Amino acid sequence: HMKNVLILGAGGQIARHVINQLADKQTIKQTLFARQPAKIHKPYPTNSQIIMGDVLNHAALKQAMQGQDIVYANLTGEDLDIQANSVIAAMKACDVKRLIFVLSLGIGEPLKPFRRAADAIEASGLEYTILRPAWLTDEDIIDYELTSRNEPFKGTIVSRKSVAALITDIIDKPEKHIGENIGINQPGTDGDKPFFM
Numbered sequence: 001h002m003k004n005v006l007i008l009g010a011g012g013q014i015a016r017h018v019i020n021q022l023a024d025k026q027t028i029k030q031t032l033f034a035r036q037p038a039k040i041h042k043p044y045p046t047n048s049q050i051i052m053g054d055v056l057n058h059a060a061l062k063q064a065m066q067g068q069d070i071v072y073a074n075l076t077g078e079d080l081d082i083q084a085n086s087v088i089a090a091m092k093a094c095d096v097k098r099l100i101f102v103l104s105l106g107i108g109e110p111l112k113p114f115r116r117a118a119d120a121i122e123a124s125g126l127e128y129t130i131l132r133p134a135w136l137t138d139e140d141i142i143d144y145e146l147t148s149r150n151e152p153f154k155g156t157i158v159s160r161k162s163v164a165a166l167i168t169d170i171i172d173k174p175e176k177h178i179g180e181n182i183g184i185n186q187p188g189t190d191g192d193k194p195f196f197m
């Protein structure tokens with residue numbers, strides 16, 4: 001089968017690397033869903049379909065969701081919780097199971113929607129992987145390590161290219177990291193002591 005990947009938030013900066021790594025995989029079809037598609041970086045891979053839509057437009061999202069195998073969400077901004085709920089519902093409506101969901105801020109009250117998004121994903125019964133990246137750099141490197149749900153981050157930063165590489169490895173082999181909620185950091189970027197607030 002063709003492997004149908006839906007990229008929600010496809011104009012995002014991590015998304016752009018994923019799209020690029022997906023561009024020469026001739027057995028993937030990638031659907032690129034974005035609010036403002038005319039600001040999706042060019043040229044447009046031949047295995048792509050570019051759809052204008054907002055994840056809170058439930059009708060648009062269901063249309064895009066039909067027939068998909070793997071959802072990759074790189075969602076930002078207000079109401080991330082409402083957004084996650086909308087993604088879960090559309091996956092369930094369209095019989096799609098596999099979700100890769102990035103939670104990156106881009107402690108405190110603005111984390112509540114993020115926590116509520118994460119909790120909703122963990123309670124969804126979907127085949128999920130939640131990805132939790134350290135501070136994002138634009139360094140041209142792939143250098144990372146992973147921490148589990150209840151472990152502290154072993155580092156301070158991680159390249160977007162690193163996070164894209166993980167996403168792509170999961171898309172390539174989607175049986176990996178099912179049911180996990182993983183921190184991603186560059187090795188040897190642990191913070192100086194002591195700590196301050």
Ligand SMILES: *Sc1ccc([N+](=O)[O-])c(C(=O)O)c1
Nearest residue numbers: 062063065066067093094095
């Ligand atoms: S992907 C999807 C969403 C909704 C519906 N629906 O019938 O309301 C369908 C479908 O046509 O089976 C598919």
